[PDB]
């Protein structure tokens, strides 16, 4: 995998630029929304039954 047929060097794989900041800055809000909407769901469904 490292080398080619020719024994060359494969190029550096790209990184999604600033993707680490992206992935946690998308983890955090949908964490908080999965918190929020299900607090909503609980507060409604206790009133239904």
């Amino acid at each position: 995998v490292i080398v080619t047929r020719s024994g060359a060097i494969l190029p550096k794989p790209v990184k999604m630029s600033f993707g680490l900041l992206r992935v946690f800055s998308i983890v955090i809000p949908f964490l908080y929304v999965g918190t929020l909407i299900s607090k909503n769901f609980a507060a409604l469904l206790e009133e239904h039954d």
Partner: protein, 153 residues
């Protein structure tokens, strides 16, 4: 008249290559813009999958430590993890391939590419035919200019 005929053959193939590249350039622009369109959409889909993956975990995180017990949520997590494999099986029943992440990524990108093709109504078949003709002209010229099969001194 050997070499003049040979350079005439080479000139013929290389100027067919020139003309077909000249036709390649206008449609390639519409191709590359619809590519960045569908790429924007499929990158949104790639992130939205992780958004779903997080907003499930927010629900399941709040709902075991704050306002229901693990006695309550444990069967729900079982049925979610079972419906996981059930949906991944149903995907294979839907389309004739597995649920593999780069494979489905390419599927969704290409499917959005054809959705953009049907909107913009560009000549995808001409694009296919011309783009094959270019590469065949390149490979046969690669066969032609061998310094072990010298035709051009």
């Amino acid at each position: 008249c050997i070499e003049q005929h040979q350079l005439n053959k080479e000139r013929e193939l290389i100027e067919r290559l020139e003309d077909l590249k000249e036709q390649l350039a206008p449609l390639e622009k519409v191709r590359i813009e619809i590519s960045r369109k569908a790429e924007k959409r499929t990158t949104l889909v790639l992130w939205g999958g992780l958004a779903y993956m997080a907003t499930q975990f927010g629900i399941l995180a709040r709902l075991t430590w704050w306002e229901y017990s693990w006695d309550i949520m444990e069967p729900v997590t079982y049925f979610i993890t079972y419906g996981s494999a059930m949906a991944m099986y149903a995907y294979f029943v839907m389309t004739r391939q597995e649920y593999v992440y780069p494979e489905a990524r390419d599927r969704q990108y290409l499917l959005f590419f054809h959705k953009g093709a049907k909107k913009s109504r560009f000549d995808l078949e001409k694009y296919n035919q011309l783009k094959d003709a270019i590469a065949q002209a390149e490979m046969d010229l690669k066969r032609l200019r061998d310094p072990l099969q010298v035709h051009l001194p």
